[PDB]
Paper text:
Bromodomains (BRDs) are acetyl-lysine–dependent protein interaction modules that play a pivotal role in chromatin biology and control of gene expression. Acetyl-lysine recognition is mediated by a binding cleft formed by four canonical helices (αZ, αA, αB, and αC) and two connecting loop regions (ZA and BC loops). This interaction site is highly druggable, enabling the development of potent protein interaction inhibitors. To address this issue, we developed a promiscuous BRD inhibitor [bromosporine (BSP)] that broadly targets BRDs (including BETs) with nanomolar affinity, creating a tool for the identification of cellular processes and diseases where BRDs have a regulatory function.
To ascertain the predicted promiscuous binding mode, we determined high-resolution crystal structures with different human BRDs. In all cases, BSP was resolved well in the high-resolution structures and inserted into the acetyl-lysine binding cavity of each BRD module. In all cases, BSP exhibited a common binding mode, whereby it engaged the conserved asparagine [N100 in BRD9, N140 in BRD4(1), and N1602 in TAF1L(2)] while extending its sulfonamide substituent toward the front of the ZA-loop binding cavity. The excellent shape complementarity with diverse acetyl-lysine binding sites explained its high binding potency, which we further characterized in solution by isothermal titration calorimetry (ITC). For several target subfamilies, BSP represents the most potent inhibitor developed to date. BSP exhibited affinity toward previously untargeted BRDs, such as TAF1L(2) (KD = 43 nM), and provided a novel chemical starting point for BRDs that had been previously targeted with only very weak compounds, such as P300/CBP-associated factor (PCAF) (BSP KD = 4.7 μM).
Author numbering: 1512 to 1650
């Protein structure tokens, strides 16, 4: 009956959905983030792709997510971290581009963090319950 696939596919779907929501609801809502919503346009930044080796932006990350490219937390956080890392490399730490990439990276970390609080707590509750029941038939 392919339970095992269905369970994994199902986990994929919920994950992508979560990632898609952090991107559009979080990272794209940072004020002054417009420039991070799309790939850096050569016509307005002709040096960009001479200095930047692995470029990324929030729209390309949405596309990846829509195609289930990110199968772990770390794979996703690798592309997110490039947002800040490419801004420091191209602009340095003093720039508004760097201040804004920082806000964007920040809220993705805060959001994934608070999520995991919630999971690891639900999980501990599940284990209490499981202990409790086993403790009751013994009595
Ligand atoms: C100060 C000297 O440094 C830089 O030029 N910095 C950067 C400049 C721009 C940038 C400019 C102009 C426009 C119109 C856009 N929008 S688009 C259509 O290219 O997506 C983006 N992005 N950017 C990003 C990301 N990271 N750094 C920069």
């Amino acid at each position: 009956l392919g339970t095992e696939n269905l369970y994994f596919q199902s986990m994929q779907v919920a994950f992508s959905f979560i990632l898609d929501n952090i991107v559009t609801q979080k990272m794209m809502a940072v004020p002054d983030s417009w420039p991070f919503h799309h790939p850096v346009n050569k016509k307005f930044v002709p040096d960009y792709y001479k200095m930047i080796v692995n470029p990324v932006d929030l729209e390309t990350i949405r596309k990846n997510i829509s195609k289930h490219k990110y199968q772990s937390r770390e794979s996703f956080l690798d592309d997110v971290n490039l947002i800040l890392a490419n801004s420091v490399k191209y602009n340095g730490p003093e720039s508004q581009y760097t201040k804004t990439a920082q806000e964007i990276v920040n809220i993705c970390y805060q959001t994934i963090t608070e999520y995991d609080e919630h999971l690891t707590q639900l999980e501990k509750d599940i284990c209490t319950a499981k202990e409790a029941a086993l403790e009751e038939a013994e009595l």
